[PDB]
């Protein structure tokens, strides 16, 4: 074996770690039996020396991930693993790293690197010979994202977050290999960050392995047989015993019950029940020579220790910390003996992070509603808020425990088992906290309804679940497993408060011959979820984002929405249309007179699909007033059918066909439908429809003959001034009812600006004009400003944003703002400014004659002097807002593009 | 609505049916509430008047399928449904149909058709106006398959099975519509038969509907509240109450418990537990003023009635039937009062088929091992065999019940509740019956391991399950759901008796980024199933038939097969090969020295996939002696690697590369590999490899230089006479070691027959030659016969099948058979014969000089005189077997095509 001092140092260090850290040391042959498959998988998956992947050790908490990583490193350091694949392996743990504030990868590695050896840069000469093991990533004080930039230099000092994110995204030592340990929650959290992923699942014990674990814990035989028989007779307990840590919990609980002499009782209704039984019986069997008052004081001090640790993302407790939280030497000895704490060096740690979270939740059970703030540990409202708001999701398990503790049954269990009283105001605290969150603005909060639903589900309190869920009106949820379907059905079964529902569902209804695959249980759960749609008589918006149905599930949803009791108003079905989908959605459209807005943005339709859609719309039970079909792959032939709808449904008044390819023959057919002075359509959006000036002829005949059409969007079309001139000739006559015109990015120039200037003088009805993103090069600007100076131009909103404007237009713009009394909004973003033009513009802006309410300008993108001038403008005209990105979101929403 | 007398007749019929059949008549508004979605879905899905679809009413037993179909027919006949879509709907029920033995569709329809109405041909004039409702298909005396042909004429008399299967496959009135009622078992049974399926699932009650049903059954309020509270406190009972029939069972059980006055106790461990509680409590509450002897005799008589009904597929009981089984008027009144039976006209029927199956299973509890045969009711051995043999699978639920009854706990429960003794030899009867079944030939007695596993699973007896499953050595199983995975894991956890395992697995491991999708539970179950492969030190053959894995499940399987304790010998992986499949399957190949046969037939490979396969095969831990790569999309370039294998692996001696496209350059490279007098390959099959005479040159150099190669298959290649003559030139020299040559379907003719005729005279080692399916005429046959008459021709097997042979060859054939003393097998199928040549052939065949053991000929395809002559031949030469399809299955198996 090659001489290596670092390898031997790690051998000694992890040999010592392997023998005293775990809850119970089992014979090594047993451990090797229990994890044989995973060890072999790892050893062969890394022998690759095209690229090397990052392998994630996947499993639930307490399954033994950290133990497996330590065994792997110990076997490598002894020379028994990766002998000819990795020369150096580094073991990084999250809690030890959290202490590091500002360090480079080299310094962190140097921490455990003996000087009497090779240098670190020399070992970095060959990066593929390095493996990084990252254990306890979920215990980090920061999140991992691509938000922060990622440097590629190991020598250069950086914050530890940047080092980890660079290592993970492979922008730092790309040749090295990564070994991650993640739970299901961590897997879902960091799936986006990880690429080229390879997974190894830990499986825990089998039934024979559970028997052997019991035989190893109980050094006798007959009581071991008794305990195994008792746990086997109960199904849920045996199922939970697959996890070695839960198995050890059950062992210690039963061992206390047996050494006490009591009969074998155990609670396995929930995981929280097993935790409560373990903690209860260890406390009773480990504290008997102590009076009740000091028992309560000691437990409360320990729980405060855990709560402070969890709120500061700390899991190692120096003696000074125990003294601060009121934990004395006697208390430390007692908890070490009863095996809720163990040493992790010179410091102490909880036997497992889950036990620490248990005590942290327990801490709130000693509290009063009118308690002074701890200034470190947040109160119940803060904990609930941080746990059900998606940004952090750090104190999740704690909150879950607290939810379960707040039930009357479990508060009773806790009080009876401990012997002292505990707070019963905690359910009310949680309820009021969730109500307060619900009454907040849904956009500013970003609720995580998966987290809230999990917490509610664990209480098994249907009335509590109904009360809490009915506080919320705008709900969004992802369903991709049966577990999440069960939880969502439980939480929404008795929900009658829905306003907006956003749903994404995958992996549940495959429709691979849905007859054989779908089950009555799945349909019943789905029907229960749908019951909220028809039971909530406040239901405005249903947004189905990339959902995957089969015929029965879709039929259930459509029949739910068809019921006359349903009050749906907006149906937003993104990217979904087939033959049976057509049939069922047409049942939806027909049956409901309350449904008025329909947005199919993105769903690629065919000729027959559009034919069937229009045939369903022509039914006289259809009250659709807004129809958005953007990016539906609609073409000219389908226009033949759409025109038909315009003839029949006098209730329809807004139609958007953006991002399609009408190609002037569809526009011809649509103008043929529109010309008839029976079509009641009031708003038309044909943005980016790949048509030209040829259609502007026919559209002109529309403008003369429609007394209902008031809004036209023709942006992103090649009009080349002939189309704009034809339309302007049509719009010269005041009898036209057009109010709003959008011709942005239409590839015209100054030449047609004269004709526009004519309509501005003759129209008494055109109030909003967007001519932005066109190269008017100050000639069009000068002509339009002179037109606006006319004492008959009733124009209210003008957009010339990003029009190749220069400081020469300023003066002429400055004179329009002070003369057009009806002009209240002007978009001039991306104009290039100097001092001599910014001064004139600001003089205009601060004037009483200037009747402008909204100015579109990008203040940040200028020098300091002009920034100071615009700030002075803001402080001298208290009615004017200067801002950029004025109309982007409004344009997207009205076109139907965003949603 | 059009006037119709048939409609009114069906209205009266189903109106009478609707009011007396059900267990409890609920208000009609309640029923319509409980089935609103399904009714609307049917009504709107059929209004479409393109092909006609088959609509299936899907749900578990007792969910209300028959009730829903009857209400649908009543509403149709009342004019409230399908008023403008169907003119005539026929309601076919299995039990009523079973009485018909041999009748046509017209007569069966006329059965319930009044004469004073329209004619049958006139109503068949427009088939589009016809709907068929098929209820109780699982209660048929015959099975439904596609084996029998399907005629399109309704007038022609046929057996009812043929009419029904033609109706289902739409080869009889294809324009008609179908409405089927099926269970999960029936759905999986008949999925193959049905096409264009449409499904409507019945959902049963919701929670509020369960409350309302309780309030409706219990006409008071306080016990309704008490019953609902008790059922709600128990999870399993509430879950089971979703089914209306199970809900009525629970209602009656609780009603007996309350009117008796006892506390509310109920066992809900299994569905069989609920049935036992219902039956026990109904019997106790309905026969208490009766002495024990007559209680037991009455229950036994009812059980006998049920048993005769189940074994004769009868479910309506005329009074003579009750008298024959010993059921009197007093007994009928008692059972009607306790609501185990109800009237269905002048006759009685069991309240539900499930109750009848329950009683039929109960009947065996009154029997003795040494009992005389009932001559109608089969004994326990016959019942178990018919239940776990796939051919019948009719009495499944009965057997399931009997299994649960046979446990000690449930026998104790039944004895305690009833009060009289019951048989305790039934576990032994079933175990011995299954042992005897296992010792039968696995090819004949078609076990249905899904049925056996379900029966074993329901007993919840791990020891009994292990004992029964270890009786079987050859197991084949399909896993397509999580339920079936759980069942197979439970049954195979402690199985260590495996010899051959055939597996087809779908729909469980999607590999849609298996990290997020796969769960530890599923992986654990799969590992438990795989544990049988490595725990059974007799494991010969593992056949994965079109299985679909992800990385973790495949890795679990491969690591299982890698263990040195594993004794795998034959690995048949049909239709699976990718890059990750490559890595893991190479772990399988490398690790195991016991593995010797490898068949990848059907798995589409690529250039690099074949490269990686060959590189894995070149490892020196590889003991493969047989390699089958038929229909693997292998081409000439991959031969370069394949040739390498032939050079390296001195253990390999059989290679089959059939159904590939080698195209003479691959064959060139392979012959370059074979020429080397180190290649130990002994048998090569290049059938259907798309090569020509150009390869026969190189193959010739093979036969001179390979002292180990003894079998060559070159069938179905365009070899013409030049290739065969080149090969014969190579094989003339006695130094060639070739023992078997297959040149069937090789497009040669009489011209090369001279050279073959030379080799037959000069070879001392060529024992089997197949020249079938080649257009050698009687001239070639005569030349070969003259060769065989030479006193040096040591040819043992000759195939001249399908060679355009005529009665002129007979004489020359007849004289070769009596001269070639070494010629023991000759295939002459498809030869045309007359009397004067058949006589010569038979005179040869019945002769002492004829040393033939096997003659390949199709006796059935000749006139009566020649048939009688060949029958006399068989009756005069007791050593000669005449048969057709002589070598087809052997050819397929040896090429690796079949399996
Ligand atoms: N295979 C095993 N055999 C015996 N004990 C185990 C095994 N796996 C885990 N344990 C015990 O369970 C605990 C698992 O905790 P840990 O190893 O931190 O897993 P995780 O990080 O997944 O929670 C350890 O304290 C160890 O004592
Ligand atoms: N929707 C329902 N509402 C109330 N009771 C029902 C309903 N469906 C079925 N039942 C009851 O359940 C029992 C079983 O009915 P059945 O239609 O025979 O089930 P299946 O057709 O599945 O065998 C009947 O006695 C009936 O009274």
From Swiss-Prot, chains A, B:
GO terms for cellular component: canonical inflammasome complex; cytoplasm. The keyword ATP-binding applies. Pfam families: LRR_6 (PF13516), NACHT (PF05729), NLRC4_HD2 (PF17776), NOD2_WH (PF17779), PYRIN (PF02758). The keyword Plastid does not apply. Its main location: cytoplasm. Keywords: ATP-binding, Cytoplasm, Immunity, Inflammasome, Inflammatory response, Innate immunity, Leucine-rich repeat, Nucleotide-binding, Repeat. GO terms for molecular function: ATP binding. LRR repeats lie at residues 651-672, 680-701, 708-728, 737-758, 765-786, 794-817. Detected exclusively in testis and ovary, and at high level in the oocyte from antral follicles. It is found in: Cytoplasm; Inflammasome. CDD domains: Pyrin_NALPs. Residues 53-372 form the NACHT domain. One of its GO terms (biological process) is regulation of inflammatory response. Gene3D superfamilies: Death Domain, Fas (1.10.533.10), P-loop containing nucleotide triphosphate hydrolases (3.40.50.300), Ribonuclease Inhibitor (3.80.10.10). Coiled coil: none annotated. ATP binds at residues 59-66. Sensor component of NLRP9 inflammasomes. Inflammasomes are supramolecular complexes that assemble in the cytosol in response to pathogens, such as rotavirus, and play critical roles in innate immunity and inflammation. The core of NLRP9 inflammasomes consists of a signal sensor component (NLRP9), an adapter (ASC/PYCARD), which recruits an effector pro-inflammatory caspase (CASP1). Within the complex, NLRP9 and PYCARD interact via their respective DAPIN/pyrin domains. PANTHER family: NACHT, LRR AND PYD DOMAINS-CONTAINING PROTEIN 12, NACHT, LRR AND PYD DOMAINS-CONTAINING PROTEIN 9. As the sensor component of the NLRP9 inflammasome, plays a crucial role in innate immunity and inflammation. In response to pathogens, including rotavirus, initiates the formation of the inflammasome polymeric complex, made of NLRP9, PYCARD and CASP1. Recruitment of proCASP1 to the inflammasome promotes its activation and CASP1-catalyzed IL1B and IL18 maturation and release in the extracellular milieu. The active cytokines stimulate inflammatory responses. Inflammasomes can also induce pyroptosis, an inflammatory form of programmed cell death. Belongs to the NLRP family. This is NACHT, LRR and PYD domains-containing protein 9. The lineage of its organism: Eukaryota, Metazoa, Chordata, Craniata, Vertebrata.
């Amino acid at each position: 074996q090659k001489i290596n001092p670092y390898r031997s140092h790690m051998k000694q260090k992890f040999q010592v770690l392997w023998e005293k850290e775990p809850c119970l040391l089992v014979p090594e042959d047993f451990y090797e039996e229990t994890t044989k498959i995973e060890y072999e998988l790892l050893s062969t998956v890394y022998l690759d020396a095209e690229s090397s992947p990052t392998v994630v050790l996947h499993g639930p908490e307490g399954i033994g991930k950290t133990t497996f990583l330590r065994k792997v490193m110990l076997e490598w350091a002894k020379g028994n693993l990766w002998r000819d694949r990795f020369s150096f392996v580094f073991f990084l743990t999250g809690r030890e790293m959290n202490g590091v504030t500002d360090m480079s990868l080299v310094e962190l590695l140097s921490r455990d690197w003996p000087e009497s050896s090779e240098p670190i840069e020399d070992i970095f000469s060959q990066p593929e010979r390095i493996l990084f093991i990252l254990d306890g990533m979920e215990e980090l004080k920061f999140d991992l994202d691509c938000n922060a930039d990622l440097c590629e230099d190991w020598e250069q000092p950086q914050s530890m977050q940047v080092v980890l994110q660079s290592l993970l995204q492979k922008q730092m030592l790309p040749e090295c290999s990564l070994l991650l340990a993640l739970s299901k929650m961590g897997m879902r959290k960091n799936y986006s960050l990880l690429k080229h992923m390879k997974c190894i699942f830990l499986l825990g014990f089998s039934e024979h392995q559970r028997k052997l674990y019991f035989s190893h814990y109980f050094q006798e035989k007959d009581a071991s047989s008794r305990a195994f028989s008792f746990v086997r007779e109960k199904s849920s307990l045996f199922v939970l015993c697959q996890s070695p840590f839960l198995c050890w919990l059950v062992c210690t609980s039963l061992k206390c019950q047996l050494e006490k002499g009591e009969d074998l009782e155990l609670d396995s209704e929930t995981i929280t029940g097993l935790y409560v039984s373990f903690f209860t019986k260890v406390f009773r069997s480990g504290s008997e020579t102590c009076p009740l008052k000091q028992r309560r004081a000691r437990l409360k001090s320990l729980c405060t220790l855990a709560a402070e640790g969890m709120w500061t993302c700390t899991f190692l407790f120096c003696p000074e910390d125990l003294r601060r939280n009121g934990v004395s030497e006697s208390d430390t000895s007692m908890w070490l003996d009863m095996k809720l704490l163990h040493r992790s060096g010179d410091c102490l740690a909880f036997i497992h992070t889950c036990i620490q979270e248990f005590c942290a939740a327990m801490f709130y059970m000693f509290t009063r509603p009118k308690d002074p703030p701890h200034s470190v540990i947040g109160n119940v409202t803060q904990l609930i808020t941080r746990a059900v708001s998606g940004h952090y999701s750090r104190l999740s398990w704690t909150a879950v425990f607290l939810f379960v503790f707040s039930t009357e049954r479990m508060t009773h269990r806790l009080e009876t088992s401990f012997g002292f009283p505990l707070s019963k105001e905690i359910k009310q605290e949680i309820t009021q906290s969730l109500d307060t969150l619900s009454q907040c603005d849904p956009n500013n909060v970003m609720m995580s309804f998966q987290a809230l639903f999990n917490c509610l589900f664990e209480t098994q309190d249907p009335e509590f679940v109904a009360q809490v869920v009915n506080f919320f009106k705008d709900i969004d949820i992802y369903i991709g497993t049966k577990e999440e379907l069960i939880i969502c059905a439980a939480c929404l079964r008795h929900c009658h408060s829905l306003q907006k529902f956003h749903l994404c569902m995958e992996h549940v209804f495959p429709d691979e011959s849905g007859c054989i695959s779908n089950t009555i249980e799945k349909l019943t759960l789905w029907r229960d979820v749908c019951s909220a749609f028809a039971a909530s008589e406040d239901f405005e918006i249903l947004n189905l984002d990339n959902c995957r149905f089969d015929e029965p599930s879709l039929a259930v949803l459509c029949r739910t929405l068809s019921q006359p009791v349903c009050k749906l108003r907006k149906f937003v079905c993104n990217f979904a249309s087939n033959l049976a989908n057509s049939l069922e959605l047409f049942k939806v459209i027909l049956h409901n007179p309350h449904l008025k807005h329909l947005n199919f943005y993105g769903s690629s339709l065919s000729h027959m699909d559009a034919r069937q859609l229009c045939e369903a719309l022509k039914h006289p039970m259809c009250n659709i007033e807004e129809l958005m079909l953007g990016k539906c792959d609609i073409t000219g032939e389908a226009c033949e059918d759409i025109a038909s709808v315009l003839v029949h449904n006098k209730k329809l008044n807004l139609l958007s066909l953006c991002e399609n390819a009408l190609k002037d023959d569809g526009v011809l057919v649509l103008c043929e439908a529109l010309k008839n002075p029976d079509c009641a359509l009031e708003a038309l959006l044909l943005s980016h429809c790949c048509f030209s000036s040829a259609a502007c002829d026919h559209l002109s005949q529309v403008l003369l003959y429609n007394r209902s059409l008031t809004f036209l969007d023709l942006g992103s079309n090649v009009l080349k001034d002939e189309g704009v001139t034809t339309l302007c000739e049509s719009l010269k006559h005041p009898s036209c009812n057009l109010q709003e015109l959008w011709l942005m990015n239409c590839y015209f120039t100054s030449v047609c600006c004269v004709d526009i200037a004519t309509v501005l003088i003759h129209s008494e009805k055109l109030k909003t004009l967007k001519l932005g993103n066109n190269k008017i090069y100050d000639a069009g600007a000068k002509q339009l400003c002179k037109a606006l100076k006319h004492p008959k131009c009733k124009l209210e909103n003008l957009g010339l944003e990003a029009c190749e404007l220069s400081p020469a237009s300023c003066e002429d713009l400055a004179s329009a703002l002070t003369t057009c009394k009806s002009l209240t909004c002007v978009n001039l973003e991306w104009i290039t400014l100097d001092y001599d033009g910014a001064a004139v513009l600001c003089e205009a802006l601060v004037s009483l004659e200037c009747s402008l309410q909204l100015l579109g300008l990008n203040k940040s993108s200028y020098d300091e002097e002009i920034k100071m001038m615009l700030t002075q403008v803001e402080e001298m005209n208290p009615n004017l807002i200067i801002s950029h990105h004025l109309w982007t979101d409004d344009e997207g929403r009205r076109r139907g593009i965003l949603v």
